[PDB]
Design a binder for this molecule. Structure first.
Ligand SMILES: O=S1(=O)NCc2cccc(-c3ccc(-c4ccccc4F)cc3)c2O1
Ligand SMILES: [Cl-]
Ligand code: NA
Lengths: 261, 262
């Protein structure tokens, strides 16, 4: 049998470098929710696997120029990896070129502010210019705003796409650092899962405000034609019904709390 | 060629309800609700014509233990009586082994309905007392959750529910709602958060959802294995999700209609 190549991304608390990782080897370098999830899926499906961090550090978008997929989606589409086990958002355009399991986690786009910022809704953001705001590159959130027809959401896209300097960031960690460093002049649009994790991490200076802007899920992704597609989907549902997904969430979000795409 | 698609669904408010003047009407026009509109939207993005049919046993779907025959909407798909189910039908592992589901169009979890003022705030609360009975719907995903759970609190509940006399189980959501309302706080109903939240905004506004949700999952649109409709419908659901149409329909049928304003 073949060792299954799992593309994933460095995103806390889903995948994280262990403390002394530089002397560690292979899968053992990494910890977190998706690292556990991978082990769970692989157990129930009976395969050996190798975690590989996505080379370009992106979730995945299709270049408008060349129509070439980057990120984790690209690794699957071009035969570089066999499965993606990541906080990878189920979308129509992605479903057109890869397969997704039933979701293992729900999320929605959300607003992160530095505590005390005078904002509580997307509409609030759209109606001012003092406080800048942006999203991750090459993910589902930027794409949600590029395509939304909803007034406020289209208004925000028109601002973000032309703002100088760039309001987009390469990594979620860069987005939070900006909110943290901007003395309240940068708000960050990100998935509620990541917002809710950051909110329980020192220095406890960020906050989720307002309700989510949309409703969707993360799913384990496979190349078209993969023999793994069905075994993995049934694995996800079994882990859901066994409470394991709830246990993993509590382990990596709240067991880990410090402040009580 | 093109043949009319048979839709199996279930009279479950606000998903499929009889229109006020239903006796004057024929076919699809007799019905209204979240899933009536959803069926309309799916049919239009997939380009098929369809008949809404109400599941004859009024059940969601489970496999009998002696015969191993599926009842409910699941049975209608499995045994070839319907072409698609467009209903609040919970995606589960046992059902995914015999039918296909689209990606979810709606999120939900098991929850607790109480008569206002009942001294219960959680599932643990229910499990640690005997004065207040509690139950679930038959032939649905919530009963099976308790039957199979290995979590101590939920198993304790099943062990009680399964042997209680008289029966704590109901044949329809309506009959659980009624039992809560007429038992003076001595009955609590376990039901999906979506339906709990809907009932909470309906007169006489004497029920409340309490405690967190006990699990997390979704409803999908289901098709029999081999169905030509599987991929078009799956993509239609995602288009409708991203267009915000699924959000628009939830509001239409839950909150814009608030009377307190499986
Ligand atoms: O049972 S699932 O099919 N499998 C297990 C599971 C576990 C946790 C969450 C879900 C889950 C459920 C639903 C939604 C969802 C809701 C609205 C629009 C689009 C969506 F996608 C997302 C996620 C979930 O869905
Ligand atoms: Cl390395
Ligand atoms: Na659980």
């Amino acid at each position: 049998n073949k060792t299954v190549v799992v593309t994933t991304i460095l995103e806390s608390p889903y995948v994280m470098m262990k403390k002394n990782h530089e002397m560690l080897e292979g899968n053992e370098r990494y910890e977190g929710y998706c690292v556990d999830l991978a082990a769970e899926i692989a157990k129930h499906c009976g395969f050996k696997y190798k975690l590989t961090i996505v080379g370009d550090g992106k979730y995945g978008a299709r270049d408008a120029d060349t129509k070439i997929w980057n990120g984790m989606v690209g690794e699957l589409v071009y035969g570089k990896a066999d499965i993606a086990i990541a906080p990878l958002t189920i979308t129509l355009v992605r479903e057109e070129v890869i397969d997704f399991s039933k979701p293992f986690m729900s999320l929605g786009i959300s607003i992160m502010i530095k505590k005390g910022t005078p904002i509580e809704s997307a509409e609030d953001l759209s109606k001012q210019t003092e406080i800048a705001y942006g999203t991750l590159d090459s993910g589902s959130t930027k794409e949600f705003f590029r395509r939304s027809k909803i007034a406020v959401f289209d208004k925000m896209w028109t601002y973000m796409r032309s703002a100088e300097p760039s309001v987009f960031v390469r990594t979620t960690a860069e987005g939070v650092a900006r909110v943290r460093k901007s003395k309240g002049k940068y708000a960050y649009l990100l998935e509620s899962t990541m917002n809710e994790y950051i909110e329980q991490r020192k220095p406890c200076d960020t906050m989720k405000v307002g309700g989510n802007l949309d409703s969707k899920g993360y799913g384990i992704a496979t190349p078209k034609g993969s023999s793994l597609r069905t075994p993995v989907n049934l694995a996800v549902l079994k882990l859901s019904e066994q409470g394991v997904l709830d246990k993993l969430k509590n382990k990596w979000w709240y067991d880990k709390g410090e402040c009580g795409e």
